[PDB]
Symmetry: D2
Subunit: 156 residues, 4 copies
C-alpha cells in the first residue's frame, strides 16, 4: 500500500500567498515521492493548492468533504463544524499554516499518537504543539524539510 | 472519475453461505465493470467477501473503518455504533442481505435521495424499503440483476 | 436515582398525518406526567415538536437535539454533525418511541436495535412493524395507541 | 428563559495536577450556584469529574457526555461517536471553560473558536494562552483563578 500523507491548512480567506506556494510545492513532492495525498475536497486555500500540485505531478488524491484534481471523493455526511479529512487514514499529517480548524486537526492527530509536521506555522503554534507532545511534533522550515521529515517518519 | 459502488451487509455471524457467495461474485463484477468498490474494511461477512472478489478481479477497493484486499483504508475515528462506510461517497449502494446496521445505512441512503439495490434481502425488507421510497429502491433477484440495475443507474 | 430518558422520533412536517401530531403531543404529556425526561429533535416542526410541547405543558423536562429553537426546549444539545442523519443522541434514551415512519426515523430505530435498546412503534404501518419485528422480535414493541406505548415504556423501565 | 449551559473541559487523571482538580471542583460549585447547567465529560476521572461533583454538591444540574457513570451526572448524553475526540457536544454551551490543557482539550477549544464561541482558559500554561489568543483575541479570556473565570463567564452571559 502506498503511504497516505495528510495535508491540513487554512481556507482561502486565511491562507497567505507564500503558504499557497508552499502547499502547491508540498503537493508536487508528495506525488513525486509516490505517496497518496489526503486533504479537504472543498476548501480553496492550502488544501486545494496541495491537491492541484499533487495532480500536476501525476499523483493520486483523496478529497474528503461533508475540482477535477480530486481523484477519490470521500463524502462524510458530518458537516463542517470540524474540518474532518478522516486524518487517522494518514501515515503522517502535515499542516501548512494555522487557524482554528487546522489546530483542532493537529491536536486530534497528537491525541491519536500520530506524527505531525508543521510548515509555516508561526512560533506560538510550534511552541504550543511541541508543549503538547514534543516527540510527535516536527517543525519544518520549508517544503524540502517537511518532505524530509515525512520520509524519515515513513522509514520509522 | 470511476464510479464508486457501495456494498453493505451483515457481518460474519449473520451472513448465510449463499449471501457470502453473492457478495464475492458482486465484488468480482464491480471490478470487471471498471468500478471502485467502497465497503467496510473490518467486517468479515458480506463486506469482506465483496472486497476479496473485487481484488481477485483486479479492481480497486476502499475499505472504511473506525486485509490485503483493502487498497485505500479510510479510518473515520467515529467508532462502531453505526456501520458507517462513508456511503454518500457512492453513486449507487448495494445491500446484500439484511440486519440492523445494514437497514440503517439503506435508510440513510434513501434519506439522501440515493438509489439502493437490494440483493438477498427477504420480502419484509424489500417491501419496507419500497414503502419508504419506491422510486429509489431496486430489488435484485441475483447478482446479474444487481449489476444490471447499477449499470442502468449509472447511465441515468 | 436518575430520571429515565425517553426518546421520541418521527417524521417532520410534510410527511406526518394529523393523527400522528395529536398522538405525539399526548405521548409527550404522558412522558412528562410519569416523571420522565423527553429527548427528541429540537427543530420545531412535526412529531418531535408536538411531543416537546406536550411534555412542557405537563411540566416535564425536555432535551432537544439539533445539528445547528422553541421555548419548549429546556436543554438544547447541538451535535455539530450532519443533517444527513436525524441524530438525537438516541443511545442516551432508555427506550425509543417512533411515532410514524420515514427514512430518518427508520435509521434511528435500526441503530437503536443495533445497540440492543428497546423500541416502541406507534402509528407505523404494517410493513414497518413486520420489518422491525423481523430484525429483533425481542426488542420491538408495537403499540396500538398512546396508552399502549406508555404502558410498554413503563414495563420496560420496571425491568 | 433557558438556563445557561457552561461547558468544562480538561485533561483526565494522569495529566492533571492536584491544583487543577481543586480548581475544577470549585468552578463546578460556582457554576451551579449561579444557576447554570454544567456540561462536561461523563467519564468519572480528572477535571471533568471534579467539576461534576462540585456542581452536584451546590445543587446544580449536570450533563455528562460519554461515547459509551457517576451518580453526580444527572443527564447522561451518549454520542455513539469515537473516543478519538473528547466530544462533549460543546457547541451546546454558551461559554467553554478549559481547566488545564492536553491534546483533546486543545481540539475542543480550537473547535469552539472555529464556531465563534468564547472560551475561558484557567490553569493553562503560557504557551497555550498565547497560542489561543493568537487564534482569536476577541474570544479567548485568560483567567487567573476560579473567581476570574466565573466573572468572565458572567460578563459574557450578560452581553
Amino acid at each position: 500500500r502506498k503511504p497516505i500523507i495528510g495535508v491540513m491548512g487554512p481556507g482561502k480567506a486565511d491562507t497567505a500567498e507564500n503558504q499557497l506556494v508552499m502547499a502547491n510545492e508540498l503537493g508536487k513532492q508528495i506525488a513525486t515521492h509516490g505517496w497518496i495525498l489526503l486533504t479537504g475536497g472543498r476548501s480553496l486555500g492550502v488544501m486545494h493548492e496541495a491537491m492541484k500540485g499533487a495532480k500536476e505531478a501525476g499523483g493520486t488524491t483523496i478529497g474528503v468533504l461533508p475540482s477535477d484534481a480530486v481523484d477519490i471523493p470521500i463524502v462524510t455526511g458530518l458537516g463542517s463544524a470540524r474540518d474532518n479529512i478522516n486524518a487517522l487514514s494518514s501515515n503522517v499529517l502535515v499542516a501548512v499554516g494555522m487557524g482554528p480548524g487546522t489546530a483542532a486537526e493537529v491536536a486530534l492527530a497528537l491525541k491519536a499518537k500520530k506524527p505531525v509536521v508543521l510548515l509555516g506555522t508561526q512560533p506560538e503554534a510550534e511552541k504550543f504543539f511541541t508543549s503538547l507532545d514534543a516527540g510527535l511534533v516536527h517543525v519544518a522550515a520549508d517544503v524540502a524539510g517537511a518532505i524530509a521529515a515525512v520520509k524519515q517518519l515513513l522509514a520509522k
